[PDB]
Write a protein that binds this ligand. Structure first.
Ligand SMILES: OC[C@H]1O[C@@H](O[C@H]2[C@H](O)[C@@H](O)[C@H](O[C@H]3[C@H](O)[C@@H](O)[C@H](O[C@H]4[C@H](O)[C@@H](O)[C@H](O[C@H]5[C@H](O)[C@@H](O)[C@H](O[C@H]6[C@H](O)[C@@H](O)[C@H](O[C@H]7[C@H](O)[C@@H](O)[C@H](O[C@H]8[C@H](O)[C@@H](O)[C@H](O[C@H]9[C@H](O)[C@@H](O)[C@H](O)O[C@@H]9CO)O[C@@H]8CO)O[C@@H]7CO)O[C@@H]6CO)O[C@@H]5CO)O[C@@H]4CO)O[C@@H]3CO)O[C@@H]2CO)[C@H](O)[C@@H](O)[C@@H]1O
Ligand SMILES: *[C@@H]1O[C@H](CO)[C@@H](O)[C@H](O)[C@H]1NC(C)=O
Ligand SMILES: *[C@@H]1O[C@H](CO)[C@@H](O)[C@H](O)[C@H]1NC(C)=O
Ligand SMILES: [Co+2]
Ligand SMILES: [Co+2]
Ligand SMILES: [Co+2]
Length: 434
């Protein structure tokens, strides 16, 4: 797609800290950009939509290539349309925003310049952030994560995409998502099938795969930390059901692992660690600091700080695994005790280390889940299982929770706030900000 300017595109600024092993931190200035799927897609020389409701224009978009030639992405009114605001080092995303039409949440990328994504090399480093999840009920997910996206959003590889990072192109994740309207400088109209329940969405013949590091998937009830390896490390197109993931009938379509090696302390048995109020180790009614460290072995360490008190990731015992480090032994034990082979099939932490050794783009999102109502995060899943099924219970939410239309109607003022991002060598991010 190309870019159009009927609405100007001004990325909300966002600062973050780059910390050094020598003990100091220096402020960086970036900004955030909304993903292309949220945008108005229209004809390059008129205001006629190329996509509207859940369907493509059959005249403007008779095929993927003609569609991309005919169509452009336009600018976003971040606050008024998308409920996205920033202040200094803080980013807020509202759940439901009403303008000319309804909007639900956002997916945002951290930029280096107005036309390029910021890339982070996670290996050997740590990432720290503050989060307020207090306004996130059952069924919602405020996510902060990394994906192996191109810094230009795909432009150099696919010149028929001239919109680029400035317009939030080039997304990929371990689901190999097929809901994206543009992939590799081509539309995704070929094979398009509208969703059953989401008025704005469908699934196309192409998907977009890449490695994914889910630092934070959470609401006020549950939180998870999850690496996802892919056999191709960076962004790569996939064909139909060969994509696997959420948007295919068979979720195991090779290249990517859509499940990951997940660590949810509640799922692992510590049901008192994270939740609303003073009965939990971490009180989710209050802001909390989350630090995630990527040691060169490929293992992942985690600690939290709230009110000046520090807690390592809680210990878990699973089969022959015992500890609090997300390592090979954990992931292998998890597959043995909970089931599945996707993470190991895709190469486990060794394959994942290829992603963290390279550049990844920071993503912050707020979403609800049309495919599984977020039950995999905060409830019992699948819902016919009981507590006797190892790993079935992931949180205290009802198995009836998280119906998107219901949570959107009941909790429209839900929101997530991410703030105080700090990045640098392991051991460096607790030092004074600049
Ligand atoms: O006409 C003329 C006119 O115009 C105007 O303008 C206008 C126009 O017209 C129009 O068009 C427009 O419209 C627009 C609007 O505005 C807006 O609002 C919209 O938006 C929308 C869109 O459309 C769509 O597309 C979207 O969609 C979305 C959805 O909703 C959501 O949901 C999604 O979300 C996502 C997110 O984001 C992310 O973040 C995520 O990610 C994730 C991943 O994927 C994964 O991988 C992970 O997770 C995972 C984990 O890790 C694992 O572990 C798990 O596993 C599990 C499993 O599952 C199970 O099975 C087991 O058992 O267990 C295990 C363990 O646990 O899983 C999980 C899951 O997978 O992580 C991460 C993070 O979280 O994802 C998600 C999903 O996908 O997204 C999407 C997108 O992509 O939405 C939106 C919002 O609503 O749009 C439209 C268009 O279309 O408008 C405009 C304005 O108004 C003008 O103005 C004028 O002037 C004219 O006249
Ligand atoms: C949960 O984790 C906290 C922090 O490590 C610990 O103090 C507590 O004993 C754990 N509770 C259970 C039931 O494992
Ligand atoms: C839940 O249902 C699935 C089939 O949908 C089945 O494989 C599984 O055995 C069921 N679990 C229980 C505990 O009955
Ligand atoms: Co309309
Ligand atoms: Co194709
Ligand atoms: Co270690």
């Amino acid at each position: 797609q190309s870019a159009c300017t009927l609405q100007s595109e001004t990325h909300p600024p966002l600062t973050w800290q780059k910390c050094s092993s020598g003990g100091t931190c220096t402020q960086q200035t970036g900004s955030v950009v909304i993903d292309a799927n949220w945008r108005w897609t229209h004809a390059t020389n008129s205001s006629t939509n190329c996509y509207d409701g859940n369907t493509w224009s059959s005249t403007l978009c008779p095929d993927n290539e003609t569609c991309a030639k005919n169509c452009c992405l336009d600018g976003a009114a971040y606050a008024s349309t998308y409920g996205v605001t920033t202040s200094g080092n803080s980013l807020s995303i509202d759940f439901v925003t009403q303008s000319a039409q309804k909007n639900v949440g956002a997916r945002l990328y951290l930029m280096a310049s107005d036309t390029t994504y910021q890339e982070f090399t996670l290996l050997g480093n740590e990432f720290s952030f503050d989060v307020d999840v207090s306004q996130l009920p059952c069924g919602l997910n405020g996510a902060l994560y990394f994906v192996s996206m191109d810094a230009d959003g795909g432009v150099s590889k696919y010149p028929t995409n001239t919109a680029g990072a400035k317009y939030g192109t080039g997304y990929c994740d371990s689901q190999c998502p097929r809901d994206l309207k543009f992939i590799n400088g081509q539309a995704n109209v070929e094979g398009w099938e509208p969703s059953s329940n989401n008025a704005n969405t469908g699934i196309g013949g192409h998907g977009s795969c890449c490695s994914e590091m889910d630092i934070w998937q959470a609401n006020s009830i549950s939180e998870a930390l999850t690496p996802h390896p892919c056999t191709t490390v960076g962004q790569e197109i996939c064909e139909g059901d060969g994509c696997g993931g959420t948007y295919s009938d068979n979720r195991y379509g090779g290249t990517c692992d859509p499940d990951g090696c997940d660590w949810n302390p509640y799922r692992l048995g510590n049901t008192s660690f994270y939740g609303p109020g003073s009965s939990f180790t971490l009180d989710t009614t209050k802001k909390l600091t989350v630090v995630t460290q990527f040691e060169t072995s490929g293992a992942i360490n985690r600690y939290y700080v709230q009110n000046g008190v520090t807690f390592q990731q809680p210990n878990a015992e699973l089969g022959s695994y015992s500890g609090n480090e997300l390592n090979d032994d954990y992931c292998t034990a998890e597959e043995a005790e909970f089931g599945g082979s996707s993470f190991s099939d895709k190469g486990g932490l060794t394959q994942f280390k290829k992603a963290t050794s390279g550049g990844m783009v920071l993503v912050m999102s707020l979403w609800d889940d049309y495919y599984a109502n977020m039950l995999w995060l905060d409830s019992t899943y699948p819902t016919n299982e009981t507590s006797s099924t190892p790993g079935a219970v992931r949180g205290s939410c009802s198995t009836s929770s998280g119906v998107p239309a219901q949570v959107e109607s009941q909790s429209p003022n839900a929101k997530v706030t991410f703030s105080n991002i700090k990045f640098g060598p392991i051991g460096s991010t607790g030092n004074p900000s600049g």
